[PDB]
Amino acid sequence: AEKEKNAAEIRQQFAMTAGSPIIVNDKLERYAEVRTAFTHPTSFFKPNYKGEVKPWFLSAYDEKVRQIENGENGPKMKAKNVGEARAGRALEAAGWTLDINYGNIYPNRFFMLWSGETMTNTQLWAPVGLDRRPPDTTDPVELTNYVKFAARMAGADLVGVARLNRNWVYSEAVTIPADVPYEQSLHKEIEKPIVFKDVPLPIETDDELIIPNTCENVIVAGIAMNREMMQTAPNSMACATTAFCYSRMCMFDMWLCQFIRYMGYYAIPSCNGVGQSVAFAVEAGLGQASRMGACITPEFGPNVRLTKVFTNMPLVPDKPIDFGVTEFCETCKKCARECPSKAITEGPRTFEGRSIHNQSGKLQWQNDYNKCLGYWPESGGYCGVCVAVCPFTKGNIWIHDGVEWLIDNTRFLDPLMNITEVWDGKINTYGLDADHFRDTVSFRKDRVK
Amino acid sequence: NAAEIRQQFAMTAGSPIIVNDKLERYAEVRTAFTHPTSFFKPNYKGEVKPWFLSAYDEKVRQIENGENGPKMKAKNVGEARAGRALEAAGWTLDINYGNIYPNRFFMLWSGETMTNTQLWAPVGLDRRPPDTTDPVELTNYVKFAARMAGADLVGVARLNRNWVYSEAVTIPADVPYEQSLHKEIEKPIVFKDVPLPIETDDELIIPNTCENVIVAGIAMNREMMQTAPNSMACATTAFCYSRMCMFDMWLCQFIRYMGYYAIPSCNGVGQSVAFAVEAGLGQASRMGACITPEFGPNVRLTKVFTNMPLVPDKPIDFGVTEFCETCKKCARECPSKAITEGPRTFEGRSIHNQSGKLQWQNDYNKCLGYWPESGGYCGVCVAVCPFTKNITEVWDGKINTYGLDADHFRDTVSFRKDRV
Ligand SMILES: Oc1cc(Cl)c(Cl)cc1Cl
Ligand SMILES: Oc1cc(Cl)c(Cl)cc1Cl
Ligand code: SF4
Ligand code: SF4
Ligand code: SF4
Ligand code: SF4
């Protein structure tokens, strides 16, 4: 008979021995955040459908407007009618409500404060003194159980702990000056170094963002996206599950940082800022790096967002996981074949970046992320076709042979041997799926060993 | 199958709340949280303070004494601290315990100044007339969005103005957060022939076109609520308040980007239990909460008011009134004897009740008096209610995302057939 799926068993079977799995060489340097395709001058500008050269997201806006006017949900994808086209973009736009300028990347601004002292919640609770009282727990075993329980309350579907590897922290962040109001933010972005110094608390000066040398650990959260909506990539409903999860990321960071602070430690939120989430996620054991470049998890494949929190709270690092992703990506190449911009390489992993957007000196599949971003104004969205077509995104993949768990190779056969229906179809709270939600149930035994 | 149950128990259309000719709209300042007769309570040292500051003093005393609640020893001081840290953190996205000030902080009545609206302005979704006016399609769209936005239950009713507060508790618009608690004022909520929700110096003005209310249920965690009146029940309460706030903002933005207006509220603007009953989420109960089939009373409520055309849901009758008539378990377990064992009447027991509607009349000042004593938000009534069915074992035990339970999460799956 069918053995019922056991995500905890799977993770136990594929756990590695301790050690960062990412292979590096001597040309590795920390990466300036301005180099990402979203921010770098070489990639920031893209034509719209009229050939006008604009900040890429404004050219994408032009395409969203054009699609609604033409009753489309995506490029050359007719909607049922204009109202359906409208509704998909309204859902997408609303999803971003708790996120600043697509990703919350500016450290210590708006929602990403490095201290809780000015927050309305901290002020309201100040008489209790939780943020000023020294820790009552220093045992990393108990702290790991407490903080992972809090992480699940705060909306994480996956949570893991790693020692902080500074190689993945940006050398300089993209931010804005502290006196710049929101309306000017996109016009006044600057770079600012992230440095590690012997100070008691995270602090920002006029010149530097300063992380204490005591900042030992990073807590990584996975925020699951909705399968039915992502499968509409590159059309509007994939944009909406992306957007809603960014606001879930923001709430997670703020909730968890406040818990850590109220336990007597400090905590730095980040969302898409501060450092490279995929590397932290790999080192914390959420999953493995992949050909497309995302972290692939056993529960969700790559169809999961990441955020992370940095802290001096003593914790027990989790073990990395190896469930064969590298070997499957070596032979699969579905994302590379389906990518509308041919951004994903079909070749082997190297240590040499394809362009300025890649960090050289770590072994990975090297993709052209200017090509990727170039497709976003064209399609009017955040694409996601690679996530949608990846076999690991199917809910389907795990089988038990009577002895152990394995991946069903039939899902990788190539070839295998609409948005109205999404709006009319299955949904549940936060877009989670009750057919698989058991996979992320947690007891103490799987929070800390 | 929960969708079958809810259809089995649908009533004919029509508000099930029985009223008489005495009913009048209720001033929000009359709640026990705010009213001058109930606001000040002694702490354990005998010092009279705002009730929540006296409750703070009890939380500190409990942590120092390694306790999770009144007369409830924790495993150690570390565990006691962790429960209060979790509770305090849960409130991160909530202003002064409930977001009641309308059109302040997170509860803005227009989206125009929000950072998300400004970023999206070149698309013009909030300026573009609606492309959809069909209430059937809009009901399906907005309910799908409500589930994305974190509602475990969602219902629609016509707006009954009887449950809208006659006057809100708020603060002047330019008062900074740090002075808010000391500068709360009353302000009338009125309905007028105006295009958009608007606030003047003198009035909060809701348009006469504001036809509908969308009510969301936000499920609390059963294991944590069963620790009431101890700290982990406080924590699931607190986290759900921040889920409420996110829900309101997300859904208001969706409705605005569809071409309509939307008023968020959380614990402000009007009486959530009455809206929830009229929208079919559940039935009124002896303790005074809305009892749902999926969660009993262990669910929080929030609501959004809009002119978006929608199809009202039917109220539901699955026998709560007859069950509460003979049960009385909440009344017997209540640590303050706040809940009556008598029959329902139209006359309130005190200023905190709205007279003129048939309900079990409870003494809510007695309830609030137990909160500084116990250092929390009690919830024993919710915990012991049959419809709802130590702290170290909770921290070491089962949990899942947002505190939801995969053993029951299938009950809130939704398809178009059950949305409209
Ligand atoms: O990570 C992202 C960054 C930006 Cl700038 C956009 Cl528009 C969308 C996504 Cl998903
Ligand atoms: O509704 C509430 C209001 C207040 Cl003021 C507190 Cl402290 C707690 C709860 Cl649950
Ligand atoms: S589609 Fe195939 S090659 Fe691409 S990331 Fe997924 S498994 Fe790897
Ligand atoms: S998001 Fe789209 S364009 Fe970018 S790599 Fe994936 S498939 Fe290619
Ligand atoms: S919250 Fe506690 S004190 Fe208040 S009515 Fe319920 S049982 Fe009684
Ligand atoms: S405990 Fe009994 S009387 Fe009280 S609300 Fe629940 S069912 Fe009704």
XYZ file of N, CA and C in Angstrom, chain A residues 217-377:
483
model
N 24.511 34.410 13.478
C 23.573 33.481 12.859
C 22.633 34.190 11.893
N 22.103 33.407 10.956
C 21.060 33.861 10.044
C 19.926 32.841 10.093
N 18.700 33.339 10.219
C 17.496 32.520 10.210
C 16.836 32.742 8.858
N 16.604 31.670 8.109
C 16.076 31.770 6.750
C 14.668 31.200 6.738
N 13.744 31.920 6.110
C 12.351 31.494 6.015
C 11.975 31.249 4.563
N 11.221 30.179 4.324
C 10.575 29.957 3.039
C 9.095 30.285 3.141
N 8.613 31.066 2.168
C 7.242 31.576 2.103
C 6.623 31.008 0.827
N 5.749 29.998 0.956
C 5.309 29.237 -0.215
C 4.370 30.046 -1.105
N 4.628 30.026 -2.419
C 3.720 30.629 -3.390
C 2.644 29.622 -3.793
N 1.648 30.096 -4.544
C 0.513 29.263 -4.924
C 0.789 28.566 -6.254
N 0.601 27.240 -6.278
C 0.951 26.446 -7.457
C 0.081 26.809 -8.665
N -1.243 26.866 -8.482
C -2.123 27.154 -9.616
C -1.831 28.525 -10.219
N -1.511 29.510 -9.380
C -1.251 30.847 -9.911
C 0.115 30.939 -10.590
N 1.137 30.294 -10.024
C 2.452 30.344 -10.656
C 2.439 29.621 -11.995
N 1.599 28.597 -12.137
C 1.525 27.873 -13.398
C 0.939 28.709 -14.527
N 0.428 29.904 -14.237
C 0.008 30.830 -15.285
C 1.146 31.710 -15.783
N 2.362 31.539 -15.263
C 3.507 32.324 -15.720
C 3.623 32.197 -17.237
N 3.953 33.302 -17.916
C 4.318 34.632 -17.404
C 3.151 35.608 -17.214
N 1.937 35.104 -17.049
C 0.761 35.966 -17.059
C 0.461 36.522 -15.663
N -0.633 37.286 -15.554
C -0.794 38.176 -14.403
C -0.959 37.425 -13.084
N -1.565 36.235 -13.090
C -1.816 35.608 -11.793
C -0.530 35.100 -11.151
N 0.488 34.752 -11.950
C 1.807 34.463 -11.380
C 2.403 35.702 -10.718
N 2.145 36.883 -11.293
C 2.591 38.126 -10.676
C 1.929 38.332 -9.322
N 0.663 37.935 -9.198
C -0.067 38.179 -7.958
C 0.417 37.281 -6.820
N 0.685 35.987 -7.078
C 1.199 35.176 -5.975
C 2.598 35.643 -5.568
N 3.423 36.058 -6.537
C 4.704 36.687 -6.213
C 4.507 37.874 -5.275
N 3.613 38.793 -5.654
C 3.440 40.038 -4.904
C 2.952 39.788 -3.476
N 1.879 39.000 -3.316
C 1.371 38.717 -1.974
C 2.447 38.120 -1.075
N 3.347 37.303 -1.630
C 4.373 36.691 -0.792
C 5.441 37.688 -0.364
N 5.681 38.737 -1.153
C 6.574 39.789 -0.672
C 6.005 40.470 0.562
N 4.696 40.703 0.588
C 4.130 41.299 1.796
C 4.149 40.305 2.960
N 3.987 39.004 2.677
C 4.160 38.012 3.735
C 5.597 38.008 4.258
N 6.579 38.172 3.365
C 7.976 38.256 3.787
C 8.175 39.403 4.758
N 7.627 40.564 4.416
C 7.815 41.738 5.256
C 7.239 41.522 6.657
N 6.008 41.010 6.735
C 5.416 40.726 8.037
C 6.267 39.740 8.820
N 6.754 38.692 8.149
C 7.611 37.710 8.816
C 8.813 38.383 9.466
N 9.554 39.183 8.689
C 10.756 39.824 9.213
C 10.431 40.659 10.443
N 9.362 41.459 10.368
C 9.062 42.367 11.473
C 8.615 41.594 12.705
N 7.690 40.654 12.517
C 7.270 39.790 13.613
C 8.465 39.123 14.289
N 9.336 38.498 13.494
C 10.391 37.682 14.082
C 11.448 38.557 14.740
N 11.787 39.694 14.119
C 12.754 40.592 14.739
C 12.245 41.076 16.092
N 10.947 41.399 16.178
C 10.379 41.836 17.451
C 10.428 40.726 18.494
N 10.105 39.488 18.109
C 10.253 38.374 19.044
C 11.693 38.261 19.542
N 12.663 38.306 18.625
C 14.061 38.149 19.028
C 14.485 39.283 19.956
N 14.076 40.511 19.633
C 14.396 41.665 20.474
C 13.769 41.543 21.852
N 12.521 41.088 21.907
C 11.821 40.908 23.172
C 12.348 39.716 23.967
N 13.166 38.864 23.346
C 13.909 37.837 24.055
C 15.251 38.335 24.589
N 15.633 39.569 24.291
C 16.859 40.141 24.818
C 18.050 40.113 23.885
N 17.835 39.884 22.597
C 18.877 39.857 21.578
C 18.568 40.941 20.548
N 19.457 41.125 19.579
C 19.152 42.032 18.481
C 18.859 41.224 17.225
N 18.285 41.904 16.230
C 17.796 41.240 15.029
C 17.755 42.248 13.895
N 18.228 41.826 12.726
C 18.286 42.652 11.526
C 17.377 42.026 10.473
N 16.315 42.702 10.047
C 15.477 42.195 8.955
C 16.162 42.427 7.609
N 15.594 41.844 6.541
C 16.218 42.108 5.241
C 15.330 41.971 4.003
N 14.367 41.038 3.987
C 13.625 40.747 2.755
C 14.602 40.564 1.587
N 14.520 41.361 0.507
C 15.445 41.176 -0.616
C 16.762 41.930 -0.462
N 16.971 42.650 0.646
C 18.208 43.371 0.875
C 19.265 42.570 1.637
N 20.365 43.269 1.928
C 21.446 42.889 2.848
C 22.349 41.779 2.311
N 21.774 40.701 1.785
C 22.595 39.632 1.242
C 21.806 38.695 0.354
N 22.502 37.674 -0.165
C 21.956 36.784 -1.187
C 21.196 35.634 -0.533
N 19.870 35.680 -0.654
C 18.986 34.750 0.043
C 19.197 33.292 -0.372
N 19.478 33.037 -1.652
C 19.618 31.651 -2.107
C 20.789 30.975 -1.399
N 21.916 31.686 -1.266
C 23.076 31.105 -0.591
C 22.777 30.825 0.877
N 22.140 31.775 1.574
C 21.791 31.529 2.969
C 20.849 30.340 3.086
N 19.859 30.260 2.189
C 18.897 29.162 2.228
C 19.580 27.808 2.046
N 20.551 27.731 1.137
C 21.302 26.493 0.938
C 22.083 26.123 2.199
N 22.756 27.101 2.806
C 23.566 26.809 3.987
C 22.710 26.467 5.200
N 21.472 26.970 5.249
C 20.539 26.658 6.323
C 19.742 25.386 6.050
N 19.978 24.729 4.915
C 19.345 23.446 4.643
C 17.918 23.480 4.142
N 17.414 24.635 3.685
C 16.073 24.639 3.109
C 16.029 23.864 1.804
N 17.120 23.870 1.048
C 17.120 23.204 -0.239
C 18.487 23.260 -0.877
N 18.519 23.022 -2.191
C 19.752 23.067 -2.971
C 19.654 24.098 -4.087
N 20.804 24.661 -4.466
C 20.865 25.502 -5.657
C 20.567 24.675 -6.906
N 20.169 25.366 -7.976
C 19.583 24.723 -9.147
C 20.100 25.384 -10.414
N 19.811 24.757 -11.561
C 20.219 25.348 -12.837
C 19.641 26.748 -13.007
N 18.346 26.927 -12.720
C 17.790 28.266 -12.896
C 18.411 29.257 -11.915
N 18.946 28.773 -10.798
C 19.627 29.613 -9.831
C 18.877 29.791 -8.527
N 17.632 29.339 -8.452
C 16.850 29.392 -7.230
C 17.208 28.238 -6.295
N 16.811 28.389 -5.037
C 16.844 27.288 -4.080
C 15.645 26.379 -4.322
N 15.891 25.098 -4.624
C 14.826 24.112 -4.812
C 14.636 23.358 -3.502
N 13.378 23.361 -2.981
C 13.059 22.717 -1.719
C 12.315 21.413 -1.972
N 12.405 20.438 -1.066
C 11.644 19.195 -1.287
C 10.145 19.424 -1.278
N 9.665 20.413 -0.519
C 8.227 20.601 -0.340
C 7.603 21.385 -1.487
N 8.306 22.397 -1.998
C 7.725 23.339 -2.939
C 8.522 23.470 -4.228
N 9.628 22.747 -4.368
C 10.547 23.012 -5.448
C 11.030 24.447 -5.308
N 11.229 25.129 -6.439
C 11.618 26.546 -6.401
C 10.458 27.499 -6.182
N 9.227 26.996 -6.106
C 8.040 27.848 -6.011
C 7.806 28.311 -4.570
N 8.774 29.062 -4.056
C 8.785 29.470 -2.653
C 9.660 30.718 -2.580
N 9.199 31.752 -1.872
C 10.024 32.927 -1.635
C 10.850 32.761 -0.368
N 11.912 33.559 -0.285
C 12.878 33.509 0.805
C 12.996 34.879 1.454
N 13.103 34.900 2.777
C 13.592 36.082 3.470
C 14.484 35.584 4.591
N 15.139 36.509 5.299
C 16.081 36.082 6.326
C 16.256 37.179 7.365
N 16.649 36.754 8.570
C 16.887 37.646 9.701
C 18.239 37.298 10.314
N 19.039 38.318 10.637
C 20.384 38.124 11.182
C 20.376 38.432 12.673
N 21.067 37.613 13.479
C 20.949 37.820 14.922
C 22.157 37.273 15.675
N 22.365 37.813 16.876
C 23.337 37.251 17.813
C 22.736 36.190 18.736
N 21.425 35.959 18.674
C 20.788 34.909 19.464
C 21.519 33.574 19.271
N 21.999 32.937 20.342
C 22.589 31.594 20.199
C 21.576 30.622 19.611
N 22.007 29.860 18.602
C 21.133 28.926 17.902
C 21.938 27.697 17.490
N 21.232 26.629 17.147
C 21.848 25.416 16.604
C 21.699 25.444 15.087
N 22.786 25.497 14.328
C 22.658 25.486 12.865
C 22.056 24.178 12.382
N 21.255 24.276 11.332
C 20.693 23.090 10.707
C 21.707 22.466 9.750
N 21.457 21.173 9.389
C 22.358 20.540 8.436
C 21.926 20.857 7.007
N 22.870 21.029 6.081
C 22.491 21.156 4.672
C 21.822 19.875 4.198
N 21.144 19.974 3.062
C 20.416 18.835 2.510
C 20.912 18.566 1.093
N 20.999 17.290 0.724
C 21.362 16.919 -0.643
C 20.379 15.837 -1.049
N 19.339 16.210 -1.798
C 18.384 15.224 -2.294
C 18.508 15.030 -3.807
N 19.699 15.272 -4.354
C 19.979 14.975 -5.750
C 19.664 16.066 -6.755
N 19.413 17.302 -6.311
C 18.995 18.351 -7.246
C 20.065 18.585 -8.302
N 21.325 18.685 -7.871
C 22.410 18.966 -8.805
C 22.426 17.949 -9.932
N 22.263 16.669 -9.595
C 22.331 15.637 -10.623
C 21.117 15.690 -11.543
N 19.943 16.037 -11.007
C 18.775 16.191 -11.871
C 18.905 17.411 -12.778
N 19.394 18.535 -12.239
C 19.578 19.720 -13.076
C 20.627 19.479 -14.158
N 21.588 18.585 -13.897
C 22.624 18.299 -14.883
C 22.030 17.711 -16.157
N 20.931 16.964 -16.044
C 20.314 16.307 -17.187
C 18.977 16.905 -17.603
N 18.369 17.767 -16.790
C 16.989 18.182 -17.054
C 16.893 19.280 -18.117
N 17.351 20.481 -17.788
C 17.380 21.639 -18.685
C 16.000 22.138 -19.151
N 14.892 21.733 -18.511
C 13.577 22.214 -18.950
C 13.465 23.728 -18.826
N 13.918 24.284 -17.700
C 13.861 25.737 -17.530
C 14.639 26.453 -18.632
N 15.834 25.953 -18.958
C 16.636 26.577 -20.005
C 15.923 26.527 -21.350
N 15.217 25.428 -21.632
C 14.555 25.306 -22.927
C 13.302 26.156 -23.020
N 12.591 26.333 -21.915
C 11.349 27.083 -21.922
C 11.544 28.567 -21.652
N 12.707 28.971 -21.150
C 12.923 30.374 -20.805
C 12.673 31.261 -22.023
N 11.734 32.217 -21.958
C 11.436 33.031 -23.153
C 12.582 33.929 -23.603
N 13.583 34.172 -22.763
C 14.694 35.041 -23.122
C 16.003 34.285 -23.285
N 15.995 32.959 -23.137
C 17.219 32.167 -23.230
C 18.260 32.633 -22.217
N 17.800 33.050 -21.036
C 18.712 33.557 -20.022
C 19.456 32.452 -19.284
N 18.915 31.239 -19.251
C 19.454 30.168 -18.421
C 20.379 29.306 -19.264
N 21.584 29.067 -18.754
C 22.566 28.299 -19.508
C 22.178 26.826 -19.570
N 22.525 26.188 -20.695
C 22.429 24.743 -20.821
C 23.765 24.052 -20.587
N 24.813 24.804 -20.251
C 26.126 24.242 -20.047
C 26.411 23.855 -18.608
N 27.673 23.553 -18.322
C 28.061 23.105 -16.983
C 28.225 24.280 -16.026
N 28.303 23.948 -14.742
C 28.610 24.949 -13.729
C 30.054 25.430 -13.884
N 30.284 26.710 -13.582
C 31.637 27.266 -13.558
C 31.777 28.191 -12.358
N 33.015 28.627 -12.113
C 33.316 29.671 -11.138
C 33.369 31.067 -11.756
N 33.119 31.213 -13.055
C 33.328 32.491 -13.737
C 31.984 33.100 -14.117
N 31.724 34.305 -13.621
C 30.452 34.940 -13.898
C 30.253 35.201 -15.377
N 28.994 35.106 -15.796
C 28.638 35.425 -17.173
C 28.769 36.913 -17.448
N 28.414 37.741 -16.471
C 28.471 39.187 -16.615
C 28.546 39.804 -15.223
N 28.436 41.134 -15.178
C 28.546 41.895 -13.936
C 27.513 41.446 -12.901
N 26.368 40.908 -13.346
C 25.292 40.559 -12.414
C 25.596 39.312 -11.586
N 26.541 38.475 -12.013
C 26.898 37.272 -11.263
C 28.088 37.540 -10.349
N 28.075 36.900 -9.185
C 29.223 36.911 -8.283
C 30.151 35.763 -8.672
N 31.333 36.098 -9.202
C 32.336 35.096 -9.547
C 32.969 34.484 -8.299
N 33.559 33.299 -8.480
C 34.253 32.627 -7.404
C 33.441 31.624 -6.622
N 32.222 31.306 -7.057
C 31.450 30.221 -6.465
C 30.890 29.355 -7.587
N 30.897 28.037 -7.375
C 30.480 27.100 -8.413
C 28.958 27.081 -8.523
N 28.449 27.413 -9.703
C 27.015 27.561 -9.913
C 26.777 27.591 -11.412
N 25.526 27.361 -11.801
C 25.153 27.604 -13.184
C 25.055 29.112 -13.393
N 25.764 29.625 -14.394
C 25.919 31.064 -14.606
C 24.903 31.518 -15.648
N 23.909 32.293 -15.224
C 22.831 32.735 -16.097
C 22.987 34.215 -16.431
N 22.416 34.611 -17.573
C 22.468 36.006 -18.023
C 21.225 36.724 -17.509
N 21.366 37.466 -16.417
C 20.173 38.027 -15.801
C 19.735 39.336 -16.436
N 20.547 39.920 -17.317
C 20.025 41.032 -18.112
C 19.033 40.532 -19.154
N 19.295 39.359 -19.743
C 18.330 38.751 -20.656
C 17.003 38.471 -19.955
N 17.058 37.863 -18.764
C 15.847 37.650 -17.965
C 15.073 38.947 -17.767
N 15.731 39.959 -17.189
C 15.005 41.191 -16.885
C 14.442 41.817 -18.144
N 15.144 41.662 -19.274
C 14.654 42.178 -20.541
C 13.290 41.644 -20.940
N 12.952 40.425 -20.511
C 11.637 39.870 -20.825
C 10.520 40.443 -19.949
N 10.855 41.079 -18.826
C 9.789 41.537 -17.934
C 8.991 42.687 -18.538
N 9.597 43.744 -19.095
C 8.769 44.760 -19.777
C 8.011 44.193 -20.958
